Design a protein around this ligand. Sequence first.
Ligand SMILES: CCCCCCCCCCCCCCCC(=O)OC[C@H](COP(=O)(O)OP(=O)(O)OC[C@H]1O[C@@H](n2ccc(N)nc2=O)[C@H](O)[C@@H]1O)OC(=O)CCCCCCCCCCCCCCC
Length: 444
Amino acid sequence: NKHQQHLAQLPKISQSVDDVDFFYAPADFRETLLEKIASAKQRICIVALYLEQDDGGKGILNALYEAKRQRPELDVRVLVDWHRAQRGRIGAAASNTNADWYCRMAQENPGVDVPVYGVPINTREALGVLHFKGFIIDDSVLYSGASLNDVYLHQHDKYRYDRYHLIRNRKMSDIMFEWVTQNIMNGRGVNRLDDVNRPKSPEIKNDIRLFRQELRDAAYHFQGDADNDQLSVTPLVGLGKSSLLNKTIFHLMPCAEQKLTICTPYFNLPAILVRNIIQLLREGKKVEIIVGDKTANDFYIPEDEPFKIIGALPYLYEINLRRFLSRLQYYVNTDQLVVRLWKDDDNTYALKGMWVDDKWMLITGNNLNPRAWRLDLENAILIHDPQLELAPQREKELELIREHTTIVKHYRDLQSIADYPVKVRKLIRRLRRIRIDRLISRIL
Ligand SMILES: CCCCCCCCCCCCCCCC(=O)OC[C@H](COP(=O)(O)OP(=O)(O)OC[C@H]1O[C@@H](n2ccc(N)nc2=O)[C@H](O)[C@@H]1O)OC(=O)CCCCCCCCCCCCCCC
């Protein structure tokens, strides 16, 4: 079996069960992060899509400044997306940016250096973003898809559901930390957001081009020290067709002997992944797909509030799901295909991951969409648990993930375009007439 061989031959870093901690809620993740910031003695590397200027973001940044204040020799770095940091939300009131905020924070803390870098994966945000996940603190990585804001940290009443794994592993964290240092920190495109005279994009357009071309080769290189019959972790990083992550995602699915479970908050599977699923289904195996309700998509705008064009995305992601469910309705009937809609009032959904049987767990920022396949800098940690040492945590986590879901029993239980609000419905129909929906899909 060529797929199983790929996995068997992946380099693997030995992992102690006692150096792996699951957390099951945003608040716990927040507290853990604050716990580790205060405790860190060597380094703190925060890579995130963004670090918002809200109570959540402030909480984390204040704690970083405080850590550096009490340990000047501490190596503290924040890396966020260059483009995202220099704008407000799409279709919101143009405002003070996070980058401006980063500048005020430096000014307001004169003695203490917490460099905030901005990482452009492409010259336009829409064609590439920093989707590298990981908070690297000393010998450990607190790993999550979460960015740093109110909802992701559950600062107040609303939350955004992600996953949270802390892994103490000297070798892995070193590999991840050094990679970030070598391939991002010093690198053409990367500029400091905590500087009022930071450049604009026209000046670095060619720096970004060469940066992307070097990241096209983005990979980790390390010797394996663990065999395929012991708990291990395999850090994976990638961008584009050369991504080892994407190839590992590809080969994982067919390795399922019983069941595959997939999480994504943006359901838009590349054809090659859909074929994997169909294969599994045709072999009598089970496939579980846990996606958010459109109302739990962070692009969703309620009927109440004025409609904005970006608010059409969750509808498109649902169209994708309904089309996918309609094709495979037989397997829903046989109870092999289980599609779960997640919804918890107006809380939002951001879960990623793959589970292959009870043996592999992929924790990743990868949303298994065209964005991750072609555009964005993605990473992951692949946990191999052959002796089932993490079974209590795996089972507990999935139990909690599934709690606020309902199983789709037929595809027509999902709304069709006809049922959508008049402005959305109209917009979407026009896009489908002139096949623009097929085009936009590639950046979704
Ligand atoms: C009214 C004006 C109309 C004009 C529209 C054109 C404007 C385009 C320029 C901006 C392009 C943004 C690209 C973002 C890609 C990204 O973050 O990709 C990664 C992301 C998943 O990252 P993950 O780590 O999983 O985390 P999140 O899910 O929290 O990431 C969501 C990001 O999106 C931001 N956001 C969310 C809601 C909102 N209203 N505005 C925001 O800025 C958040 O602040 C955050 O940065 O994957 C995605 O986000 C998947 C969707 C990609 C969007 C594709 C480009 C924009 C749509 C296309 C234009 C046509 C309109 C639609 C017509 C049907």
